[PDB]
Amino acid sequence: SELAGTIIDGASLTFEVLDKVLGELGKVSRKIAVGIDNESGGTWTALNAYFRSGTTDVILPEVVPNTKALLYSGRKSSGPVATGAVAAFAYYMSNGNTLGVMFSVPFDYNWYSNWWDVKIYPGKRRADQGMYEDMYYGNPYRGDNGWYQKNLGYGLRMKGIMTSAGEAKMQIKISR
């Protein structure tokens, strides 16, 4: 039972599916369910991922169809006691770029903030701690409730939603 519900059309795969799946598939005490919607224009082929706290089995599917959404799972490092949910992954676009998604959920939110960003490298690029922390400081977003995001280069726009509720979900959809 991994925190991967369904990957059906984004019209059905929404924030609500992420809130519910945490209770349905709920691996350990602190669980992470995110919902990215691929509408950038092309099938997303998995290349590589980098998990530091959200340590899981599988998150990068072989190929993802466009105009649709997907789910990610992750559970803590030690299991019962550890950091909330921290990981970064990347997706190969058929247009000739690499969508590098970044997500960080600490545990001492009382002091340390939880910045989150998304960029698209101009070619086949990995996701590692250097590239994570190098772009982390670039978009100081803690997940403002409602719908909050940044504009992307190359003529693109990604849309996202998170909240400071502590154990909240993460949903990001590309909207041209």
Per residue, the 3-state secondary structure of 96-165, as one string, reads CCEEEEEEEECCCCCCCCCCCEEEEECCCCCCCHHHHHHHHCCCCCCCCCCCCCCEECCCEEEEEECCCC
Let me know: does 52 contact 31? Beta carbons within 8 Å.
Answer: no
Let me know: does 1 contact 57? Beta carbons within 8 Å.
Answer: no
Residues comprising the binding site for phosphocholine?
53, 86, 104, 106, 132, 136-137
Chain centre to alpha carbon of residue 147: 15
B/e letters for 75-103, b = 16+ CB within 10 Å, e = fewer, are bbeeeeebbbbbbbbbbbbeeebbbbbbb
Specify the number of domains making up the chain. Answer: 1
B/e letters for 14-48, b = 16+ CB within 10 Å, e = fewer, are bbebbbebbeebebeebbbbbbbbbbbebebebbe
Which method was used? NMR
- Residue 67 φ/ψ region, left for φ over 0, alpha for ψ in the -120 to 50 degree band, beta for the rest: left
Residues comprising the binding site?
53, 86, 104, 106, 132, 136-137
Cα end-to-end distance, the chain, whole Å: 34
Domain carrying residue 139: 1-176
| CATH assignment at residue 175 | 2.60.270.20
